[PDB]
Each structure stands twice: as C-alpha cells, then as structure tokens.
Enzyme design. Structure first.
Site, PDB file in Angstrom:
ATOM      1  N   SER A 209       0.856  -1.191   0.000  1.00 32.15           N
ATOM      2  CA  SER A 209       0.000   0.000   0.000  1.00 32.15           C
ATOM      3  C   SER A 209       0.890   1.238   0.000  1.00 32.15           C
ATOM      4  CB  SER A 209      -0.989  -0.104   1.162  1.00 32.15           C
ATOM      5  OG  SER A 209      -1.927   0.959   1.128  1.00 32.15           O
TER       6      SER A 209
ATOM      7  N   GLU B 201      -9.327  -5.225  -4.123  1.00 31.83           N
ATOM      8  CA  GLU B 201      -8.565  -4.100  -3.588  1.00 31.83           C
ATOM      9  C   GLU B 201      -9.457  -3.032  -2.965  1.00 31.83           C
ATOM     10  OE1 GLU B 201      -4.447  -5.059  -4.142  1.00 31.83           O
ATOM     11  OE2 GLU B 201      -5.467  -3.400  -3.128  1.00 31.83           O
TER      12      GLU B 201
ATOM     13  N   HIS C  29      -7.900  -5.511   0.768  1.00 30.95           N
ATOM     14  CA  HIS C  29      -6.614  -4.831   0.710  1.00 30.95           C
ATOM     15  C   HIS C  29      -5.797  -5.108   1.968  1.00 30.95           C
ATOM     16  CE1 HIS C  29      -3.830  -1.695  -0.585  1.00 30.95           C
ATOM     17  NE2 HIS C  29      -3.936  -1.122   0.601  1.00 30.95           N
TER      18      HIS C  29
END
Ligand SMILES: O/N=C/c1cc[n+](C[n+]2ccc(/C=N/O)cc2)cc1
Ligand SMILES: O/N=C/c1cc[n+](C[n+]2ccc(/C=N/O)cc2)cc1
Lengths: 540, 540
Positions: free
Chosen positions: B200, B331, B444
């Site tokens: 990320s 995601e 995610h």
C-alpha cells in the site's frame, strides 16, 4: 473488620469499604446488585428484581459499566474522557451504590439519589466526578446512585410489542428506587425523605419519574440540573422509535434476507448480535446531521408515559412537591464542536456568518426554512451581524436555549403555578482547572464537580475559594434534601434564596460571590421557543 | 551466554533477543535507533543520523510507534485493531529492527527491507503481522524494517520553506536504507543485495525510492504490493499541500489572532502544539467526503521528486532492475465501509442504484459530472443495472481499479517496456481466519500475513494447507531477493512464473492451487482509467 462495613439487606449480606476524606471517613457500599443481569433473552426486557444470594457479596468496588459508545473525538483529553467509562463494559451492569456517614446515623437520615446524564446513550455511576464521599461527609446525608441501561439496550423500542417495549432504562432506575424504599433504612437512611437529583439526561429522567404515577410514590423531592423531560431531545414518538430500531437491525444484518419481518423475529435476531456490534452502529440511525440529538431515548408509548411530557406537565397537580431546577451559564457551547461547522476546541471558533447560518440548521434540526429564518432574526445582533465572536456566542445560545434553558424554564413555570414549590439557579462559575477552551465559558455539565464536593479532593488543584464555594453548594443541596428549602433553616446572615414563581420568575446566581437575585430565565428568548415557534410550524 | 545476541554497529553495541519458531530460533535486534529523535525544533525537519552511544543499547523489544490517528470505527474488532499501534505513541520513534538467522550467516546474505503501509498516516514496524521471524527462519535471509514519520509529522509541507519542506517521512526511510548499507554486514547481510518490499503506502514508498536518484543507489530490487507512486492518493501538489498545512494550523489556533502568517511563524506555532492535538484534526483538512484519500502524503516539489511520479516513470531508464508487483483480488472492498453510502461490515451491503451513483462520487472525488458518468457506464452491467450484489461488487471494482490495480498495471507496463524485468501476481486466497465479512472477498492488505509466514505461528488457527501455501510464498519472495527471479533456480518441475511484458501482460494467480498464468491486469478497465479518462478531463 470494622462492624459498620457489614450490612444485611433483603437479598443478603454485603461488605463495604471505608473511604477517606480530609474531614473524616465515610462508609461506602459499591456494586450492590439490584436486578438480575439483563443478558441473553433478557436483552431489551424490563428488569427483574435480584434474587436473594448466599454468603457475603463484596461491595468494595464499582461494578461494570453498561455497554455504551465511547467518545474518541479527543483522545487523551481530560474534558471528554472524564465522562467515558472507567470500568469494563458489560450487559451485566445493573448495580447501585450507597454512601453513608461514619459513624452510621442512628436516626433516619434524608436520602439523595443521583441519576447520571449522558444523552441516554452513555454514563456510569462510577465516574470520578460522581464520587459521593465528600457530600456524605460534609452534610451527613445518605447518597445512592445506580447504573441504568443506556443506548439501544435501554431505550430501543418497537412500540406495541412485548419483546422490546422501550423505556426499560427508566424501569431500571425505578427498580433502584424501589430498592431504596426497601433497604436504605439498613444504612441509616430515611425512606420517607428521598430526594432525586440528576443532570442532563438524568435531570430529564428525574422529570419523567415526576410524571409517572408508579414512580411518583418512591420519592418526595426533585432536582433537575440542566435538563427537563420536555426537551426536544429527551423523547421520541412511536413511529420514529420504530424506524430507528428497524434501521439498527438492518445495519447489523437483521433480518437476514429474505426472512422478515415482524417484531418477534426482529428482536430475536438483535438478541443474537454481540453487544459491541449494536453500539458500533448507534449513531447511524439519526435522521439528519445535528447536535444535541440522540438515537435511543425514552419513547412516548402510553405506558411509562401516558402522554407526552408537555401534556402531562400542563395537566399535572404538583401540590406538596418541592423542586430545585437550574442551568449552567453556557449550556450550548459544549455541543458546537460536535457538528457545527467552523468550530474547534483548539482554536477560537470565530465563525463566519455563512457558518452561523449553516450551524442553525444543525442546532435546530428538521425545522422549516421559515422557522430557521425566525431563529436567525432573534439571535442576530443586527448592529454587528457579521462579528465572529458574537455569532459564536449566538449559536451557543441557540443550542442552549432550544435544548436546555427554555425547556427548563417552561417546566419551572408550570410547576410553580400548579402547586409545586420551585427554586431556580444559574451556575456561573468556571472551574479554575477546566480543560475546555475559554470561549466555552461554563459548559454543560461542569457544575457537577462542585455539587459533589470534588474541590475538597487533596490530590486536585482547586483554589481555596472553590473549596468554600463547593461547601456552600453542598449545603444548599443538602438543605433542600432535608427540608425542601435550600436556605439555612435559621441563619439570617446569608442572603436568601427566594422561590421561583410564574410571575416574578426569581432565581439566584451561583458563583464565588454571595447570592444575587435575578428575574427571568431568558424570558425574551424562551417566549420565542415556547410561545411563537410552535405556532410558526403549525401554519407550515 | 549466547554471543550471537551481541553485535557492534557504527554507533555502538547492541543486545538482541532470540525468537522461537517451530523450525528453529532466530536472532532479532528490535528498536535500533537510526536517527536523532525528531522532537522539539526538529519537528517537520529531515532526519539526522543517530550519534554514537556508549554502553549496550537494549534491542530486545520494539520501540515507540510514531504519532498517528488510531482507528476506532469498530472497537475491539480484530480486522481493524490489527493495524492500530501496539506500542505507545511518541515522536521519539525513528527506530529500526533486523532479524537474522541462527546461527548467524558466515557468508553475506541478501537483505529484505520492509516498508509498512497505512495511507502515509498510520503504521508501525512492530505490528504482529509484520513479524519477520518465520521469513528469516524458513528462507535464511536478513530482514530489516524501520519506522518512519506519518501524518503531519512526516508529510506536512509548506513547499519552498525551510522549516517544513515536506517528504521528511520518505527521508526517514532513506536514512534507514543508508543505515543498512553501513551496518547490515555486522548481522551477516549483503549490502550489495538489498530488496525493498512494501504494501500500500509502503509500496508507493518503494516506488518513490525507485524514482529518486539519491535513494536508487541504496538498493537493487523492488517489490510493490497493492500500491504504486503514481496512484491518485500517493502524491499531492504544492498548492494543495500548502492549503492543507495552513488549514491544520488554523484548526489548532495557528497563527494567533493578530499576528502574521508566513511560513516561519506558522511552523513555529505548529511546533509548540502537543502532538496529539495535531493528530486530532488531521482528517478535517481533506477537501471533500471521500474514501482512499489521505491528508498528508508525499508532495511533488522538485526536491525528493524532481517531477510527478507519472512523468518520472515515463522518462525513466530501468535497465538492470528487477521488480515484483501485484495486487489482491478485492482491492476496493475494504475502503467502502469508510464512507460509501449503504455499506456496513455487519450486513451484506446490498446497495441500491441510488447509493451506487452516490458512491461513485465518493470513490472518485473531484471529477466532472461527465467523468462520473463515464465511470457509471463502464462499471454498470446494463443487463442487470439495479442488482444490489452486482452494484456492490462494481463499486468495489471502481475504488480498487482507480486507486490500486490500474496505477500498478500502468507502472508495471512502463517498467518492463523500458528495461526492467517485471513479475506480476494477483493474490486470490482468502484467509480462513479473516474477520471481515465474506462479501469483501480478499481485501486490501490481507496477503501480508502469508508473505511473512504468520500461518506458521502455533498459537494461530490456520489450516495445514495455508501453512504450505505460506511457505510457497516465502520461497517466491526470497528467491526474488536472492536472484531477482521468483522461480526456483534448481527447478523445472514446478509451474513457472513468466515475466510481465507490456505486450503479453502475463501474471500468475497466488492461491492454494498451483500457479496459473493469466494475461491482462484488468486491461479493459485500466484502459478507461489510464487512457480515456485523462483525455475526458482535458476537454472538461
Ligand atoms: O463511527 N462513528 C463515529 C461517530 C459517529 C457519530 N458521532 C456523533 N456524536 C455526537 C455527539 C456526541 C456527544 N454529544 O454530547 C458524541 C458523538 C461521533 C462519532
Ligand atoms: O468524528 N470523526 C470520526 C472520523 C473522522 C475521520 N475518519 C477518516 N478515516 C478515513 C479512512 C480510514 C481508513 N481508511 O482505510 C480511517 C479514518 C473517520 C472517522
């Protein structure tokens, strides 16, 4: 073991604890169970009396806090965390506390019963600011305080149904009052002289018990601090309560698609959800952006409240009842940092006029545009319509008058004119240790620490005059509990506190200065809220 | 006395700790200071190297977490608490950790350097999910992880000024990379074989070190998991960064009423504020209701990034570089419960058509009404335009493609076509212990626990197959760290992982099944975001 720390009540035996004060010890009994744990199938149901127990229940520490939302707006901030739970959360929370003087009174002593506030969504009797050791030591009265269910666990209502009738948090308080009638004599307390006092939602609760016949016989006096049952936030209608309960069920997956539907299936699905899951979606059921509005509050369903608080107040006979009511100097400033645009506790909050106009819609939710224009007209200084500091104080007055001051003034007038003896005050001292910003003045809820004698705590940094001021306040509250009159039963030296009447509307200012008599609890502003504005919405 | 727990570095001597795994012990050195504490006048300033120390610094436990916002959206919920700080908050937080195998390697060993994510506003190297004991034991590599300043402390920027230049959190990471070059040999690590990997915002950090010349010489390989520096959330302009910094100062009372507001006085006023006060107003500077947007992120000012990441990626020569990139299967689902209307982790989030249309504006902030229409066109199944389940998955794809998948695919194509060797993956296994709802799929950030071998922890309830799957992934990552190729060098029996090219666009699916080769990182959807939508906004 000191013999006075061992007491027997109708349910069984208890062991208390001795608390120290600078003036002497007191005996405390913390965490006495007064109801069966409202868990499992008992969730949302009225409380059941605590069955008798064997052995000695330990009453040396506070019990668990009822499940509730925890304020995380300002992590580590004293001003907010002083109201957050200081014990572990649990649905097993229906416990009460008793403070009694040492040595125990040999003759029956008047009893003070505290009901905490917290918008009906939060609160606990274990908060440090509700410590009853200084009030009991200085005035030699008996003090009781109870936990009651808040949030959905105390006030979720599907009106008509028996699985979730609503107002069960008020029934928790009533059961605690019935417990005081049956057991307070064992601590030296007089069950024929019980004075209820509470603040904010607790004050509203005290008002609801005045208007409910089954509760009225359980006490004899009432003190309503910065709250009233007729406030626009204190009650909801049956239709709106059903919508909020159904939306909360939807947010937690109740009912599962596609099953339905009726109230029995809806509450059954809600009873399987963990308590924290219900808390995590509580605020998401409010109808619109607002301040001073709470999701699950007492419902007007015809049971606990045969009619709306406004109707019961007007048609009520209050002869033989003494009431003490009051407000703080800045009732609305606290709530502005919780949604009003342009406000922040860490700056001066010098809002613009555009922010003021938008803030009126947040402070007065779902009123017509015409009604908002009427609010703006009354609270604008048209010689300085753009001055940020005046607009900041104006919006604070809007929220404070609408939610607290004018509902309280309306109640005090109807009470006095219909048989009740009423005394009114305005608390105008800002604590020297107050952590909220200066522009908030004397915020909502910051007279409590002086009523409970907290300045006497040697571990705190109050001034010498604040200690004298706290003792003078405890004297007022205790004198009212004993005789129904805050004035000293004989002392002619101290200035007198005149009763509040619907005509003269006299009240006193509570601060470091001696008592000063004033007239009218914002009579001009409250005539707008109580007289004209209701007519403005009837003709939409 | 184990002598392997004693190590000398350029700054002084350290004492480590032995960590147990089911396969054997490893030696850990947790909490090594690599910079002077960025406190007082050093707040918002670039880091400076830690001065040498006398005696033995204890490196047996993790140090403090950098000051950051704490997620309270779901109190007590494992899915969110696992990312919250597990050590006390402090501005004294610039410490790093190194795990090394036992016995210590005698020949230089390739080094893995972890950079955590968290939207540049949160994160810590001490989180349980970043426990490097299993990766180091199973693959016998050297693992390093560092803390870097997040939020305003790491990325508040008044561009051009000296007191708050911005990107100092990225400079924290770079100083830690210079530390690895000068000291990792003392732990048995090879400073000529350093592979950065992050997830990320950490992946975006890894990408920005690729594009910064002073950082490029400090490592040799890169792994970008679910993030890229060209993401619409990963950078901000000079004008917008100045507005957010000035807004934060206003919310905390800077500057005081009546004083000037140049950059010197503004930062000086900010440096006098308690760190928690800055954290409490961080989210209130974002320009509009949104998801996957963060207040203080790397700024494009011409210093750390001489140009925008998109420009540097296009004009970059990447010969001699190996990159591993990838995404998770879902995601965007994680971010929908943080603002998208109708979404809740405790129900099925079967949104309506109206909620989907409103959610597109939250998931894609500040696009013209015409641009939002183009999004609705591409992400509507016009044979089932009102099916709630399809709309829920469509909005998840909108947020995931816009923020992660298509920025990563754009980067992977430009890298491979301009000299770099690129390998791509899609992580498609949902952990059996995952606490988020089923409809979120593989959210995610939930490949990290398998990369770090967390299923090997005996105190966890992973399945036997998930343990073997974790060992496969650790082998892939270590093989890439050693040779720049995730495929096993002594091996044609296992399915091969083909490189990613701008033409074939091959990638592999990572799950319990053997490797499967696919083509196209959502090529149709990413052509909309990367090719057409920029032209649509040029013509407004
Ligand atoms: O994830 N949910 C966050 C969140 C949702 C709703 N609020 C509203 N709110 C209003 C008034 C008060 C106290 N008023 O005295 C406390 C809290 C805060 C936080
Ligand atoms: O009373 N205010 C509550 C409140 C203020 C600010 N936020 C912002 N926010 C955005 C994204 C995330 C995580 N994203 O992955 C976490 C937190 C939420 C709630």
């Amino acid at each position: 073991e000191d013999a006075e720390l061992l007491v027997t009540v109708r349910g069984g035996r208890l062991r208390g604890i001795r608390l120290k004060t600078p003036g002497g010890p007191v005996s405390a009994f913390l965490g006495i169970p007064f109801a069966e744990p409202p868990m499992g199938p008992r969730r949302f149901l009225p409380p059941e009396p605590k069955q008798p127990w064997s052995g000695v229940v330990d009453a040396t520490t506070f019990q668990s806090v009822c499940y509730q939302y925890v304020d995380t707006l300002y992590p580590g901030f004293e001003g907010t965390e002083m109201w957050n739970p200081n014990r572990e959360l649990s649905e097993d929370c229906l416990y009460l506390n008793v403070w009694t003087p040492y040595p125990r009174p040999t003759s029956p002593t008047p009893v003070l019963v505290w009901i905490y506030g917290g918008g009906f969504y939060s609160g606990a009797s274990s908060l440090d600011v509700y410590d009853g050791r200084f009030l009991v030591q200085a005035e030699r009265t008996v003090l009781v305080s109870m936990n009651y269910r808040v949030g959905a666990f105390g006030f979720l209502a599907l009106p008509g149904s028996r699985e979730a009738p609503g107002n069960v948090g008020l029934l928790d308080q009533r059961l605690a009052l019935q417990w005081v009638q049956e057991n307070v004599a064992a601590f030296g307390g007089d069950p024929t002289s019980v004075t209820l006092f509470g603040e904010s939602a607790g004050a509203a609760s005290v008002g609801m018990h005045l208007l409910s016949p089954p509760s009225r016989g359980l006490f004899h006096r009432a003190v309503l601090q910065s709250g009233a049952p007729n406030g626009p936030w204190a009650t909801v209608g049956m239709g709106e309560a059903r919508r909020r309960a159904t939306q909360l069920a939807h947010l937690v997956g109740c009912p599962p698609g596609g099953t339905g539907g009726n109230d029995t299936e809806l509450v059954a699905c809600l009873r399987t959800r963990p308590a924290q899951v219900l808390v995590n979606h509580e605020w998401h059921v409010l109808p619109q952006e607002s301040v001073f509005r709470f999701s699950f509050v007492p419902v007007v369903d015809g049971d606990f409240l045969s009619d709306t608080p406004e109707a019961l107040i007007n048609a009520g006979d209050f002869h033989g009842l003494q009431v003490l009511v009051g407000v703080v100097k800045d009732e609305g400033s606290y709530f502005l940092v919780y949604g009003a645009p342009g406000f922040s506790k860490d700056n001066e909050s010098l809002i613009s006029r555009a922010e003021f106009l938008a803030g009126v819609r947040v402070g007065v939710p779902q009123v017509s545009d015409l009604a908002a224009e009427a609010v703006v007209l009354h609270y604008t200084d048209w010689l300085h319509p753009e001055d940020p500091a005046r607009l900041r104080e104006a919006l604070s007055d809007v929220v404070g008058d609408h939610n607290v001051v004018c509902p309280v003034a309306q109640l005090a007038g109807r009470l006095a004119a219909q048989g009740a003896r009423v005394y009114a005050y305005v608390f105008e001292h800002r604590a020297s240790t107050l952590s909220w910003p200066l522009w908030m003045g004397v915020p909502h809820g910051y007279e409590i620490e002086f009523i409970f004698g907290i300045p006497l705590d040697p571990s705190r940094n109050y001034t010498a005059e604040e200690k004298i001021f706290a003792q003078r306040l405890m004297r007022y509250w205790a004198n009212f509990a004993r005789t129904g009159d805050p004035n000293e039963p004989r002392d002619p030296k101290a200035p007198q506190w005149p009763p509040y009447t619907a005509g003269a509307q006299q009240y006193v200012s509570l601060d470091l200065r001696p008592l000063e008599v004033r007239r009218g609890l914002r009579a001009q502003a409250c005539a707008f809220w109580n007289r004209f504005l209701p007519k403005l919405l009837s003709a939409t």
